[PDB]
Amino acid sequence: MSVKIGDIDGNGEISSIDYAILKSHLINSNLTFKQLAAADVDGNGYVNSIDLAILQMYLLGKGGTSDIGKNRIYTYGDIDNNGIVDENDYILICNHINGTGQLSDASLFAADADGNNVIDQTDRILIEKYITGRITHLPVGNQLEHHHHHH
Ligand SMILES: [Ca+2]
Ligand SMILES: [Ca+2]
Ligand SMILES: [Ca+2]
Ligand SMILES: [Ca+2]
């Protein structure tokens, strides 16, 4: 779903608690891919130590010019997030499965079509179905429905 950037604790509000959890993933810890998406504030897809710094800047009042407090609307099934669930996104899921290519933190949730926070082989097959129009919805959401231009 559209992930609130900055809210790492999952209370809904941007707070100091979020920073403490974000810090620990960058020091030594792994979170759910959903948290990873929320952790990527700058929108490069990677949870950088820069992300905690900008979150800290937002908290301190220096300036958190990233997606902090906004919702990351990623195109559901679109890992590169160009607005199209395309065949290269499909390639990326299979890259994780093969272990040949790494996807960035936020991209790990963007690729997670089923919403279990794991890039498994089922996501790969959900994208199979989504690209071929077999399923109009992914468990994580869909972008066939455009709101303006429903159909
Ligand atoms: Ca919070
Ligand atoms: Ca980032
Ligand atoms: Ca794409
Ligand atoms: Ca999955």
Side-chain angles (χ1 to χ4, degrees):
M1 212 293 178
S2 308
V3 175
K4 179 170 183 164
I5 301 308
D7 182 64
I8 313 297
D9 56 53
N11 89 276
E13 301 287 58
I14 314 303
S15 50
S16 52
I17 310 302
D18 302 291
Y19 170 85
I21 305 171
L22 178 55
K23 277 279 284 293
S24 51
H25 167 61
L26 291 158
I27 309 175
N28 62 94
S29 188
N30 190 29
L31 303 177
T32 58
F33 295 178
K34 211 304 297 297
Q35 302 301 32
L36 292 190
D40 178 55
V41 301
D42 54 53
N44 75 328
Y46 298 85
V47 182
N48 309 328
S49 44
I50 307 173
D51 294 270
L52 68 75
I54 305 173
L55 182 63
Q56 187 185 150
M57 297 303 85
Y58 189 93
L59 269 41
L60 274 50
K62 298 294 190 183
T65 191
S66 304
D67 285 279
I68 312 172
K70 297 165 68 294
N71 291 89
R72 167 78 62 232
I73 306 176
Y74 57 94
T75 306
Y76 305 110
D78 169 31
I79 310 174
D80 60 62
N81 192 29
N82 68 328
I84 305 80
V85 183
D86 65 92
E87 301 173 86
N88 298 270
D89 301 287
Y90 172 71
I91 296 175
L92 270 53
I93 300 181
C94 312
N95 287 332
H96 180 100
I97 293 166
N98 295 330
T100 49
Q102 275 64 89
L103 289 58
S104 46
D105 301 79
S107 300
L108 292 174
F109 191 56
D112 186 52
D114 54 54
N116 76 332
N117 300 275
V118 184
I119 301 307
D120 63 285
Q121 300 184 29
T122 311
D123 304 285
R124 177 192 55 137
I125 303 301
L126 293 176
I127 299 307
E128 282 277 276
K129 297 177 181 179
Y130 193 86
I131 297 178
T132 50
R134 295 172 61 178
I135 60 179
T136 48
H137 291 248
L138 294 175
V140 68
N142 81 91
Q143 285 293 31
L144 295 183
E145 202 301 269
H146 292 107
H147 300 89
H148 290 259
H149 284 143
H150 296 294
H151 185 263

